[PDB]
């Protein structure tokens, strides 16, 4: 019954040279009855993106209440938030929540405006952080994805063999998840420019 | 674990163990169990850890801001504010704790708050998963008003014992003596306690 | 559970709702309307716990109507939809939360386009073509799998979901006393009491 | 989960593995159990991870708020009587276990806060998984004052007993050197035992393998 | 027309008059105190008049102990001063027991000034009409003074002075001070030190004292102690000699 | 002035008229004496019979708060029992928490405080008597008298009232003719006479005079009410010397 | 003497609250702000009043300010109160949006806000506020609207609305030259073919001014919203009549 | 005198708060204080007066560090900027730091700190503070920056100013000898010559208190491992660092 696994799905990123790709499966469904292939999980503020898997009600939450957050930084700074400043955030705001957590597991991704560097990084239920050079994984099909990315993952990959190593990752972990699939979508992030991309996949 | 505190000629003498299990694992084998509110105020605390230490630093508190007040506090005294904690709160705390110290009239006096902050002045205590094996001993072998070492060689052999059939409890002993000359301490290793 | 279903056609969206209401052993009645209209062209189902279920359908469609004569502008479905969802979403980590499930579907005269949201109460929401709360789901979702198109008229819908109900109570062990029809678009809403009358 | 500390002359160690575990699997494998109160106050924390990060967080902040104003260098017991007091405060369903250790205008320190609020001394202490492995590494080769170097090298010898003998506990090493009349030294990676060797084939795809539905090209600002 | 009748407004020179009033009530006490600092020691002095054949001059004093560590004296009236004495007594209980270490002389006072601002600018409470003087031996400054007054002021004296007589027992001792070009007295026991100030105060006013017209206090290596009645005699008479 | 309406604004000179003025409230009422034997200490207050339709023995002006303090004012009355109320809970949650009955010394602060507080706000009315009370704890007996501006001390004997003058005078005197501790009986005796002398004031009102007493040897550390016999006595072991 | 305008809590014979009409006359001594509606876009123009040699300028601002992605103002009166109101204007906005995930409406935000300014002038110790503003923005219920609201809580929509200092002029030349269809590069002339007209200086400066524009069409489904740099300024403003 | 500068909640006819001037006397009264804006580096002074030269001046700080990163200054009612400084300090803390994972620009500090000094006009009850601050600090995205705070609650950014007794003048020697480019070694000189006309006392180390944002100090941590965490802008000069550069005229 555990309460992040009642909707199911799967979030994954990864870092290469000059970018970062992230991606996620697009099931939403009641215990085994599946009832959409539409539901995205990942969202964005300015070049900041996140993805947040568990409690489908808490991921539409939490959305609207970063987004809600980000326009009001924006505003005051008179800039958009950056990728750690961020993380820093969603790490606090979901620990203001300690003894009554929003079930899910986000995990942020973009490029540094000003120094231009790749970022990623994963947190669990009450907050903790969790920065890493090369990948991030969250959901049910958890244990799959790093046996995927404990694999295929290369350091330092060029955008478009990015896209093709965290495809595969995605894909095959969901193809061995009974409540992830459905469909995909991919993103490939560089300091300008940003491709989106939804795959072909079992519907199954 | 094992702590009492003996009153006689002078004044009174509280000691106990070092050991300190969680589990059959032992967390710190050199424990100071023997806590200090004030000068011529200690106490030996028993039963939980995080507990009995908190109420302490509170009991100490409060005396701190009674002397500079109401001038140096009795015995009688500390043992209350020690209660009142004890008892307004018997559902969540576990507290064992023997309370001794010197005073110049009274001599030195003796004061034991089990669980329940039911408080009690006896000649002298004995408090700690130990103490149950030295109800011979203790009892049997305890004249009234004794000198400063014709009884340190009682505190020695009781919690001798305690440390011999309660695993819970051993380490090295420790003992303070609160008298009109002030305080001491003292430390008798196992090499020896076993000796005998 | 009640049966609540729903579908989106051409341009419009209707509603199915089993009629029956039962307290344990008896059925205290077979013509109950789990509809209520919260405004001229949004319309919302509901189906959960006993008392739960209509205090808060009477709840929100207060709320809209409160907007509605405020602002003298109607809300969208899509912003209507949302309204809920955030009540409900409050309502899970509350004492005590509204047990309740729901469908809306209403016509967004503004795009002139139909849309029908379906939401659980933990305040899960979801836009799709068709819905379906409860074991509702699982005798129905194939058979609209298989013949849907979103071109239907409001005409080939009501055939479709006639083939769903007479599966409903084929394979379904309770008899739910059948269901009430209503359709929603560009005029409003109207109910096809002739699914009754048949 | 795997740490110790110990003082020797000048000041005062404690090391921590980097492994963060979540069931059998591993989440981190380069995690870090060191934090900083202040300056020359570090702690280590076992236990629930998110839990030990943030407390440190907010009682470091106050202390920094407290020196401020005050004009002293934080004291090591400010640092523990705030921690154990909020510990306790919440009869421990904030899982923070720590090694609290630093340097005051008053001498070197190290104290071990368990869950409840319960606090304990010594001059050489372990907390974690693999605490046990760690502390027959420090009842065998203790000896009262001890080289910096050999302060060091024990405590990073605890360590490493407890990388290989437990299974919560692994990857690398972190220490932290807390020197009287002298700055911190943070040490990420004093040591690197483990290093997956290289695979055995490459596993890059060409280009075109996976297949695509749809793309576009997402907008950003306004 | 009564600027001057509330604590809070301010006149056309920002000036809030109420808060200067409560000072010249920090007078109508008529008595004189002035504390200096040795090299391990702190001494404060103060006159103690006993105008009354009843009264028992055991609890007739200006100097009380806050803490087991510094010593308080106060200029103004016994009531107002007495309840000042308890806060500050009672924050230093509660310092102690949330830091795990005993509060400086330095803070205290800034917890007061502070106190007596907020005391002062939210407008609860009307201002207490006394300058409080705190001494003790800090282990990171060791003779410290600090003196707060009621408009929430404070400030580090190498010894100072308060009373009907502030410049008089104050230049008195700028000229002594203006001599040996250092900020402190210099002797190993405070004994001496106190024979310093009652016989550099006598100087000032033009008066004799016995043990009873005057009051001392003094503070060592972590222990305040208030000088004794019959003792006080005793460095009155070492120093009546060795002019 | 502008000065003598608010309760807690400062005159010019640093001046609370609001509170003085509450002083001339005091020194109109009836005459309270305090005398403080050797061992405990002597209460007595001036009743006033205004008609003879005043049931006597009724109508007690002293209270005892716990079972050790004496208690005794002049001024208001109802402001009066009101002090001590809350003297009596200060007294009691003291008692409850430490064990042993409160240090008489300790009692003043808290009343003092209490006092001290009614001269901070301006929306409340200082109190308007003159207290004197003591009793006798484990450092013996102690006797204080304090007063509406929360000010207060230690005294070897004291009184407050319309007439209190001769209280002192006809006061300072037995100190001086038996400089080391009066009488515990003795007290009681010299008590009644005091009065008398003082009641001259009244004379045309006839009065009931009301004595207790607290002491170590014939209370036996409780505070008494002195009635039956040796009340009788006192009173004509004065009637006697009125002569 | 005596009048009525003491505070906002009184109503003088006639119905009038003063306390309201002054705060609406602080107004005039602020700097002359526009805004000119178009048949594709809206202008906001305000004139910086505060001035000195070395005033930062060309990062901060200060009359102009973005509440919405869609909606701008115009601020002109009290620097503060202003703050105080952008800011809760900024958290109401994003309320809507969070519940109906949907952008507010002007009007809806205008109403809001004028409901609070509402407020300060019916309940006791409270103080309008001295803020006057011109609501600038587009929702796709009303197109692009201009509104304004003043201290006493009312708005009102304008086609092009003048507030501020010498607003008689400001207003009476546009109610002249304004062609009710105008493009917006008119309204940026007629923008400064009124500012200019309406200032003292020796000449209008471009560090002392302030625009912003909105525009949208088919290209962009939606709304662009631009707050001109002292670049493009200095530049535009030569492009007219300046050297 | 009128009858309506007796209230924080009301409006003079024309239109004018009065408390508030009157507020902002106290400070147009306060010592001598000055900030300029460098290129490369932002300067605060402020003057010191003894009441007798038997009070030690060297306990009680004028210039103060809110953040390692920013430092302020004042000119008014001593007391009030005490502790003024202590709620900045915190309000640095629980509203930014605490969320955030790091320190506030010095643009939202300077407007957190507004806040609080805006509540004390807002209501009647309590009085204004009549203290009036400099705050100068850095933060990567805006470079160096100076700005003025007033009881009002309204703040204002500068490149150079001050406020004081002797700031007519002062602001006006200012204004002469200003221009983009300085650099902070330049405007620590500046500085002085123009702290100096300001004062009838003297000019040695002590009487003068002024420090300066510029360049991070890896010495002024106290620790040293991680990369990122490099060190506080804000020095407070000491006694000697000044007399030197006074020498050098």
Same mark, same amino acid.
Request: with cysteine; glycine share 8%.
């Given at each position: ?5 009642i909707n199911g799905?799967?979030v994954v990123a990864?870092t290469?040279?000059?970018?970062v790709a992230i991606?996620?499966?697009?099931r939403?469904g009641?215990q ?6 539409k539901?995205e999980?990942?969202?964005?503020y300015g070049?900041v993106?996140?993805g947040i898997?568990?409690?489908?009600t808490?991921?539409?939450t939490?959305?609207?209440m970063?987004?809600?957050k980000?326009?009001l ?9 950056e990728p750690e400043?961020?993380?820093?955030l969603?790490?606090?705001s979901?620990?203001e ?6 079930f899910?597991?986000?995990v ?8 231009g560097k790749?970022?990623?990084?994963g ?9 890493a050079?090369?990948?991030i ?6 244990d799959q994805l ?5 694999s295929?993952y290369?350091?330092?990959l060029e955008?478009?063999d990015?896209?093709?190593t965290?495809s ?6 969901a193809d061995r ?7 995909a979508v991919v ?7 940003v491709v ?9 | ?5 003996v009153?006689?000629k ?10 300190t ?10 424990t100071?169990?023997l806590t200090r509110?004030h000068d ?8 939980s ?6 109420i ?8 701190e801001?009674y002397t ?6 009795s015995?009688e ?5 020690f209660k ?6 018997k559902?969540?705390?576990?507290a064992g ?19 329940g902050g039911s408080?009690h002045?006896?000649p002298?205590?004995?408090?700690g998963s130990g103490?149950?094996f ?7 072998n ?5 000198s400063?070492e014709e009884?340190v060689?009682?505190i020695?052999?009781?919690l001798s014992?305690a440390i011999?059939?309660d695993?819970?409890?051993?380490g090295?002993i420790r003992?303070?003596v609160?008298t009109?000359?002030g305080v ?13 | 559970?009640?049966?609540i +279903?729903?579908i989106?056609?051409?341009?419009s969206?209707?509603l ?8 344990g052993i008896?059925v +205290?009645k077979?013509?109950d309307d789990?509809?209520?209209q919260?405004s001229?062209?949004?319309?919302m189902?509901?189906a959960?716990?006993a008392?739960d279920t209509v ?7 207060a709320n809209?109507?409160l907007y509605?004569i405020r602002?003298?502008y109607e809300?969208?479905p899509?912003?209507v ?11 899970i980590?509350?004492?005590?939360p509204?047990?309740? &499930?729901?469908?809306?579907?209403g016509?967004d005269?503004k795009? &002139?386009?139909?849309?029908?949201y379906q939401?659980?109460?933990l305040?899960?929401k979801?836009?799709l073509?068709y819905?379906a709360?409860g ?8 058979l609209l ?7 239907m008229?409001t005409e080939?819908?009501?055939?479709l979901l ?5 599966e ?6 309770m ?5 009430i029809?209503?359709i929603?678009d560009?005029?409003?809403i109207?109910?096809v009491?002739d699914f009754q009358?048949? | ?5 110990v003082?020797?002359?000048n000041?005062?160690?404690i090391?921590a593995?980097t ?15 060191l934090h900083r109160?202040?300056?020359?106050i570090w702690?280590a924390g076992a236990?629930?991870a998110?839990?030990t990060?943030?407390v440190?967080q907010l009682?470091?902040?106050?202390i920094?708020?407290?020196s401020?104003?005050?004009?002293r260098?934080?004291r090591?017991?400010?640092?523990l009587?705030?921690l154990k ?5 919440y ?5 923070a ?8 205008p008053?001498?070197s320190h190290?104290?071990?806060?368990h869950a409840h ?11 974690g998984s ?5 502390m027959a590494?420090?009842e065998?080769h203790?000896?009262?004052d001890?080289?910096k170097?050999?302060?060091?090298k024990l405590?990073?010898?605890?360590i490493?007993?407890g990388?290989w ?12 050197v807390?020197?009287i009349?002298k ?7 004093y040591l690197?035992?483990n290093?997956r060797?290289?695979?055995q084939?490459?596993?890059k ?5 996976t ?12 | 027309?009564?600027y001057?009748?509330?604590?809070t407004?301010?006149?056309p ?5 109420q808060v200067?009033?409560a ?9 004189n105190?002035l504390?200096?600092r040795?090299?391990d ?8 008049k ?21 010593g308080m004296?106060?200029?103004?009236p016994?009531?107002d001063?007495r ?6 007594k ?7 027991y949330?830091y ?9 006072a ?6 007596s601002? =907020?005391?002062?600018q939210?407008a609860y ?5 006394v300058?409080?003087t705190f ?7 060791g003779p410290?003074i ?5 408009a929430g002021?404070?400030?580090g004296? /190498?010894a100072?002075?308060?009373?009907p /007589?502030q410049?008089?027992i104050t230049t008195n001792?700028e ?5 040996? /070009? =250092?900020?402190h ?11 310093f100030?009652?016989?550099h105060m =006598?100087?000032a006013?033009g ?8 009051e001392?206090?003094?503070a ?8 004794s009645?019959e003792?006080?005699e005793?460095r009155?008479?070492?120093i009546?000699?060795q002019? | 002035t502008?000065?003598d309406?608010?309760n807690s604004?400062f005159?010019?000179?640093g001046?609370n008229?609001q509170?003085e003025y509450?002083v001339?409230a005091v020194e109109?009422?009836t005459?309270?004496?305090?005398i ?5 200490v002597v209460?007595a207050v001036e009743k006033?019979i205004?008609? @003879?339709?005043?049931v ?5 002006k ?5 079972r050790?303090?004496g208690?005794?004012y002049?001024?208001?009355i109802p402001?009066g ?5 809350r003297?009596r809970?200060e007294?009691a949650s ?6 042993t ?5 300790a009692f003043?602060?808290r009343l003092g ?10 929306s ?5 008597v003159?207290?004197?009370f003591?009793?006798?704890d ?5 006797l204080?008298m304090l007063?509406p501006?929360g000010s ?6 004291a ?8 209280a002192?005078?006809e006061?300072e @005197?037995?100190?001086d003719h038996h400089?080391?501790?009066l009488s ?6 010299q008590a009644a @006479?005091?009065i008398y002398?003082?009641?001259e004031?009244? @004379?045309e ?5 009301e004595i207790?007493?607290?002491?170590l ?6 505070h008494k009410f002195?009635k039956?016999d040796?009340?009788?006595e006192?009173?004509?072991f004065?009637?006697?010397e009125?002569? | 003497?005596?009048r009525y305008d ?6 003088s ?5 003063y306390q ?10 602020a ?8 048949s594709?876009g809206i202008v906001?123009?305000?004139?910086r009043k505060?001035?000195?040699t ?6 901060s601002?200060?009359?102009l300010?973005?509440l919405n ?6 601020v002109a009166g009290?620097?503060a109160?202003?703050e105080i109101?952008?800011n809760?204007?900024?958290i109401?906005?994003q309320?809507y ?9 002007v ?7 004028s409901?609070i300014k ?5 309940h006791?110790?409270?103080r309008?506020f001295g803020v ?5 923005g587009?929702?796709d ?7 304004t609201?003043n ?9 092009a609305?003048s507030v501020?200092?010498?607003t008689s002029?400001?207003?009476?030349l546009?109610?002249?030259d304004?062609?009710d ?6 309204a940026?002339?007629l ?10 200086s ?8 302030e ?8 290209n962009?489904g939606?709304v662009?919203?631009?707050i ?7 530049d ?7 050297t | 005198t009128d009858?309506?500068?007796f209230?924080?909640?009301?409006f003079?006819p024309s239109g ?5 001037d009157?507020?902002?006397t106290?400070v147009?009264?306060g010592?001598?204080?000055l900030?300029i804006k460098?290129?490369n ?7 010191? %007066?003894?009441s007798?030269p ?6 009680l ?12 200054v004042?000119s008014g009612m001593?007391?009030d900027?005490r502790?003024?400084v202590? %709620?900045?300090?915190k309000?640095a803390?629980t509203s930014?730091?605490?969320i955030?994972?790091?320190?506030p620009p010095?643009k939202?500090?300077?407007?957190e700190?507004?806040?609080?000094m ?7 009850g309590?009085?204004?503070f009549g ?9 990567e995205?805006?470079?160096f ?10 703040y204002?950014?500068? %490149? ?5 007794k002797?700031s007519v003048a002062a602001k006006?020697?200012?204004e002469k ?10 405007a620590?000189?500046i500085?002085?010559?123009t702290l %100096?006309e300001?004062v009838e006392?003297?000019?040695n ?8 944002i510029?360049?991070?100090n ?7 491992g ?9 020095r407070?000069?000491?006694?000697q660092?000044?007399?030197d ?5």
């Amino acid at each position: 019954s555990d309460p992040s696994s009642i909707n199911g799905g799967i979030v994954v990123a990864m870092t290469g040279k000059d970018c970062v790709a992230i991606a996620c499966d697009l099931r939403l469904g009641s215990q085994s009855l599946g009832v959409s292939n539409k539901f995205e999980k990942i969202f964005h503020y300015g070049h900041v993106f996140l993805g947040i898997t568990g409690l489908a009600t808490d991921v539409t939450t939490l959305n609207e209440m970063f987004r809600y957050k980000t326009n009001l930084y924006k505003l005051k700074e008179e800039r958009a938030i950056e990728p750690e400043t961020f993380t820093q955030l969603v790490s606090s705001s979901l620990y203001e929540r300690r003894f009554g957590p929003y079930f899910v597991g986000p995990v942020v991704a973009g490029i540094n405006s000003k120094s231009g560097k790749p970022f990623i990084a994963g947190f669990d239920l009450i907050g903790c952080i969790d920065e890493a050079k090369d990948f991030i994984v969250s959901g049910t099909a958890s244990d799959q994805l790093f046996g995927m990315c404990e694999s295929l993952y290369e350091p330092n990959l060029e955008p478009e063999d990015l896209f093709e190593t965290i495809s595969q990752a995605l894909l095959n972990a969901a193809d061995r998840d009974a409540l992830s699939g459905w469909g995909a979508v991919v993103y490939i992030i560089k300091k300008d420019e940003v491709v989106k991309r939804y795959l072909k996949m079992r519907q199954d | 674990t094992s702590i009492m505190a003996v009153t006689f000629k002078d004044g009174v003498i509280l000691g106990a163990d070092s050991r300190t299990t969680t589990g059959a694992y032992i967390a710190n084998r050199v424990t100071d169990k023997l806590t200090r509110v004030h000068d011529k105020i200690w106490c030996c605390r028993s039963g939980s850890a995080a507990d009995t230490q908190a109420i302490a630093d509170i009991v100490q508190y409060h005396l701190e801001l009674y002397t500079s007040q109401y001038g140096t506090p009795s015995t009688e005294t500390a043992a209350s504010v020690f209660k009142e904690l004890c008892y307004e709160n018997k559902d969540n705390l576990t507290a064992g704790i023997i309370v001794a110290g010197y005073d110049d009239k009274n001599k030195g006096e003796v004061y034991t708050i089990p669980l329940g902050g039911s408080v009690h002045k006896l000649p002298y205590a004995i408090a700690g998963s130990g103490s149950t094996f030295i109800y011979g001993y203790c009892d049997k072998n305890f004249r009234e008003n004794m000198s400063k070492e014709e009884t340190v060689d009682f505190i020695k052999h009781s919690l001798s014992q305690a440390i011999k059939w309660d695993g819970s409890s051993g380490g090295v002993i420790r003992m303070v003596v609160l008298t009109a000359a002030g305080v001491e301490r003292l430390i008798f290793y196992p090499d020896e306690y076993e000796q005998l | 559970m009640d049966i609540i +279903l729903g579908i989106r056609v051409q341009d419009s969206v209707i509603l199915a709702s089993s009629k029956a209401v039962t307290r344990g052993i008896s059925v +205290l009645k077979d013509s109950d309307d789990k509809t209520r209209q919260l405004s001229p062209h949004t319309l919302m189902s509901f189906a959960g716990e006993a008392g739960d279920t209509v205090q808060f359908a009477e709840y929100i469609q207060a709320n809209i109507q409160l907007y509605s004569i405020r602002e003298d502008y109607e809300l969208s479905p899509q912003a209507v939809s949302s309204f809920v969802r955030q009540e409900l979403a409050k309502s899970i980590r509350s004492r005590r939360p509204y047990q309740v &499930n729901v469908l809306i579907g209403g016509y967004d005269k503004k795009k &002139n386009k139909p849309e029908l949201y379906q939401i659980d109460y933990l305040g899960t929401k979801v836009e799709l073509p068709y819905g379906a709360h409860g074991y509702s789901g699982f005798y129905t979702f194939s058979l609209l799998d298989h013949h849907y198109r979103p071109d239907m008229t409001t005409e080939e819908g009501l055939d479709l979901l006639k083939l769903c109900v007479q599966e409903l109570e084929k394979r379904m062990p309770m008899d739910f006393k059948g269901v009430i029809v209503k359709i929603v678009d560009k005029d409003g809403i109207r109910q096809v009491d002739d699914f009754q009358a048949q | 989960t795997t740490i110790v500390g110990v003082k020797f002359n000048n000041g005062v160690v404690i090391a921590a593995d980097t492994r963060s575990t979540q069931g059998p699997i591993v989440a981190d494998k380069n995690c870090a159990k060191l934090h900083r109160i202040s300056p020359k106050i570090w702690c280590a924390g076992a236990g629930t991870a998110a839990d030990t990060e943030a407390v440190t967080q907010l009682i470091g902040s106050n202390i920094e708020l407290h020196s401020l104003y005050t004009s002293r260098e934080p004291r090591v017991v400010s640092a523990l009587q705030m921690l154990k007091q909020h510990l306790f405060k919440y009869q421990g369903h904030i899982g923070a276990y720590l090694i609290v250790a630093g340097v005051d205008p008053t001498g070197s320190h190290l104290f071990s806060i368990h869950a409840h609020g319960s606090t304990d001394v010594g001059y050489y202490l372990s907390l974690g998984s693999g605490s046990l492995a760690a502390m027959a590494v420090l009842e065998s080769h203790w000896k009262q004052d001890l080289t910096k170097e050999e302060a060091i090298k024990l405590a990073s010898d605890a360590i490493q007993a407890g990388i290989w003998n437990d299974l919560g506990s692994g990857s690398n090493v972190d220490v932290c050197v807390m020197e009287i009349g002298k700055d911190a030294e943070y040490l990420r990676n004093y040591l690197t035992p483990n290093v997956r060797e290289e695979k055995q084939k490459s596993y890059k795809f060409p280009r075109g393998t996976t297949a695509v539905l749809k793309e576009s090209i997402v907008n950003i600002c306004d | 027309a009564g600027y001057d009748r509330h604590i809070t407004i301010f006149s056309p020179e920002g000036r809030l008059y109420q808060v200067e009033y409560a000072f010249k009530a920090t007078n109508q006490t008529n008595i004189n105190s002035l504390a200096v600092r040795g090299k391990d020691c702190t001494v404060v002095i103060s006159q103690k008049k006993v105008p009354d054949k009843l009264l028992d001059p055991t609890t007739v004093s200006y100097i009380f102990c806050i803490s087991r560590t510094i010593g308080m004296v106060v200029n103004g009236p016994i009531p107002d001063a007495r309840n000042a004495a308890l806060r500050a007594k009672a924050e230093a209980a509660e310092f102690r027991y949330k830091y795990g270490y005993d509060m400086p002389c330095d803070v205290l006072a800034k917890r007061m000034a502070n106190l007596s601002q =907020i005391y002062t600018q939210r407008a609860y409470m009307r201002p207490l009409g006394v300058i409080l003087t705190f001494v003790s031996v800090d282990e990171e400054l060791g003779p410290s003074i600090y003196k707060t007054d009621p408009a929430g002021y404070y400030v580090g004296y /190498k010894a100072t002075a308060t009373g009907p /007589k502030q410049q008089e027992i104050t230049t008195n001792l700028e000229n002594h001070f203006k001599k040996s /070009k =250092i900020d402190h007295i210099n002797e190993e026991s405070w004994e001496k030190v106190v024979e310093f100030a009652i016989t550099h105060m =006598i100087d000032a006013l033009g008066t004799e004292f016995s043990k009873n017209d005057l009051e001392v206090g003094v503070a060592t290596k972590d222990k305040f102690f208030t000088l004794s009645a019959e003792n006080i005699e005793e460095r009155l008479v070492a120093i009546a000699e060795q002019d | 002035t502008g000065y003598d309406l608010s309760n807690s604004v400062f005159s010019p000179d640093g001046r609370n008229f609001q509170v003085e003025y509450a002083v001339k409230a005091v020194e109109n009422g009836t005459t309270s004496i305090g005398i403080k034997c050797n061992d405990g200490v002597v209460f007595a207050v001036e009743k006033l019979i205004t008609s @003879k339709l005043l049931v006597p023995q009724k109508n007690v002006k002293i209270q005892v708060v716990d079972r050790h303090i004496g208690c005794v004012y002049s001024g208001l009355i109802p402001d009066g029992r009101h002090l001590v109320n809350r003297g009596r809970e200060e007294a009691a949650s003291f008692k409850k928490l430490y064990k042993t009955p409160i240090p008489i010394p300790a009692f003043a602060d808290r009343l003092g405080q209490y006092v001290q507080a009614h001269t901070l706000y301006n929306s409340v009315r200082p109190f308007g008597v003159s207290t004197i009370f003591g009793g006798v704890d484990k450092n013996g007996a102690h006797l204080y008298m304090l007063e509406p501006s929360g000010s207060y001390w230690g005294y070897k004997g004291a009184a407050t009232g319309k007439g209190r003058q001769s209280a002192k005078a006809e006061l300072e @005197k037995l100190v001086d003719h038996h400089p080391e501790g009066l009488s515990a009986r003795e007290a009681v005796k010299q008590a009644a @006479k005091i009065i008398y002398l003082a009641h001259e004031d009244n @004379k045309e009102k006839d009065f009931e005079l009301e004595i207790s007493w607290c002491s170590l040897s014939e209370t036996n550390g409780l505070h008494k009410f002195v009635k039956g016999d040796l009340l009788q006595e006192a009173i004509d072991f004065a009637q006697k010397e009125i002569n | 003497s005596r009048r009525y305008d003491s505070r906002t809590t009184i109503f003088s014979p006639e119905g009038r609250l003063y306390q309201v009409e002054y705060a609406l006359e602080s107004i005039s001594h602020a700097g002359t702000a526009i805004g000119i509606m178009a048949s594709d876009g809206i202008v906001l123009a305000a004139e910086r009043k505060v001035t000195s040699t070395l005033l930062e300028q060309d990062t901060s601002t200060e009359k102009l300010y973005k509440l919405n992605d869609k909606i701008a103002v115009a601020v002109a009166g009290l620097t503060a109160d202003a703050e105080i109101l952008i800011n809760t204007a900024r958290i109401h906005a994003q309320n809507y949006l969070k519940t109906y995930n949907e952008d507010i409406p002007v009007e809806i935000l205008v109403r809001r806000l004028s409901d609070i300014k509402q407020g300060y002038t019916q309940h006791g110790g409270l103080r309008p506020f001295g803020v006057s503003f011109i609501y600038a923005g587009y929702d796709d219920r009303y197109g692009y609207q201009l509104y304004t609201s003043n201290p006493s809580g009312n708005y009102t929509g304008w086609k092009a609305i003048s507030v501020g200092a010498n607003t008689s002029a400001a207003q009476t030349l546009l109610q002249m030259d304004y062609k009710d269809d105008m493009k917006v590069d008119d309204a940026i002339e007629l923008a400064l073919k009124t500012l200019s007209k309406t200032t003292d200086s020796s000449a209008l400066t471009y560090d002392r001014l302030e625009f912003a524009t909105i525009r949208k069409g088919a290209n962009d489904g939606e709304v662009y919203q631009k707050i001109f740099k002292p670049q493009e300024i200095k530049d535009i403003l030569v492009k007219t009549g300046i050297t | 005198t009128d009858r309506y500068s007796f209230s924080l909640t009301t409006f003079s006819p024309s239109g004018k708060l009065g408390q508030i001037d009157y507020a902002l006397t106290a400070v147009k009264q306060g010592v001598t204080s000055l900030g300029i804006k460098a290129t490369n580096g932002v300067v605060i002074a402020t003057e010191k %007066k003894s009441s007798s030269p038997l009070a030690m001046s060297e306990t009680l700080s004028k210039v103060s560090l809110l953040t390692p990163d920013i430092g302020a200054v004042y000119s008014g009612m001593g007391p009030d900027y005490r502790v003024l400084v202590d %709620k900045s300090r915190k309000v640095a803390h629980t509203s930014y730091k605490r969320i955030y994972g790091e320190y506030p620009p010095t643009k939202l500090l300077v407007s957190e700190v507004a806040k609080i000094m805006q509540e004390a006009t807002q209501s009647g009850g309590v009085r204004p503070f009549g203290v009036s601050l400099l705050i100068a600090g850095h933060d990567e995205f805006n470079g160096f920056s100076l700005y003025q705070v007033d009881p009002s609650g309204s703040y204002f950014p500068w %490149k150079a100013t001050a406020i004081g007794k002797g700031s007519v003048a002062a602001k006006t020697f200012l204004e002469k000898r200003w221009n983009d480019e300085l650099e902070l070694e330049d405007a620590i000189h500046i500085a002085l010559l123009t702290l %100096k006309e300001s004062v009838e006392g003297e000019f040695n180390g002590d009487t003068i208190e002024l420090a300066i944002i510029g360049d991070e100090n890896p010495d002024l941590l106290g620790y040293t491992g991680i990369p990122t965490d490099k060190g506080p802008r804000f020095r407070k000069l000491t006694s000697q660092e000044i007399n030197d550069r006074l020498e050098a005229l």
